[PDB]
C-alpha cells in the first residue's frame with residue numbers, strides 16, 4: 001500500500017497536471033499511440049489519425065484527454081479507496097472497449113515519460129517512485145475485476 005507521505009507526493013505531482021489537463025492528456029495519448037500503434041486501433045474515434053501532426057491538431061483528442069485525466073485524477077485523490085470509481089471503468093474497458101491490461105501498463109509508462117518531458121528537474125526520484133506505486137495499485141485493482149469477468153490478460 002502507499003504511505004501517507006507517498007500519497008502526498010502523488011497528489012503534489014498531480015497538481016502539475018491540473019495546471020494544464022488538456023495539454024498533459026494530449027501528450028500522454030500521443031506518446032501511447034506512437035510508441036504502441038496497436039493501441040490506436042482500439043479507438044474507432046481516433047483510428048483515422050495517421051501522423052503526429054494530425055494528432056496534435058485534433059481538438060477531439062484533447063477533449064478525450066481531459067475525460068481520461070479527469071477520471072484518473074478523481075481516482076488518485078481517493079488514495080486507494082476507489083472501488084466505486086474503478087468498477088465502471090473496469091467493466092467498460094474489459095467488456096466493451098476490449099482493452100487488455102497490458103495496455104494499461106503502456107499508458108502508465110507514457111504518463112511517467114510525459115511528466116519527465118514537461119517538468120525536467122522538477123519530477124523528483126521520490127515522486128517518480130510514488131507515482132509508479134500509485135499506477136501499479138490502479139492496474140492491480142482493475143486486473144482483479146478483469147479476472148472476475150474472464151478477461152485476465
Ligand code: HEM
Pocket residue numbers: 039040042043044045067068069071072088089092093097099103104107
Ligand atoms: C489511465 C487509464 C485510463 C483511464 C482513466 C480511462 C478512462 C476512460 C473514460 C473515463 C472513458 C469514457 C467512459 C467509458 O467508456 O468508460 C474512456 C473511454 C475509452 N477508453 Fe479509456 N481510460 C484509460 C485507459 C485506456 C487505454 C489504455 C485504452 C486503449 C489503449 C482505452 C480505450 C478507451 C476507448 C476505446 C474508449 C472509448 C472512446 C470513445 O469512443 O468515445 N482507455 N476511458
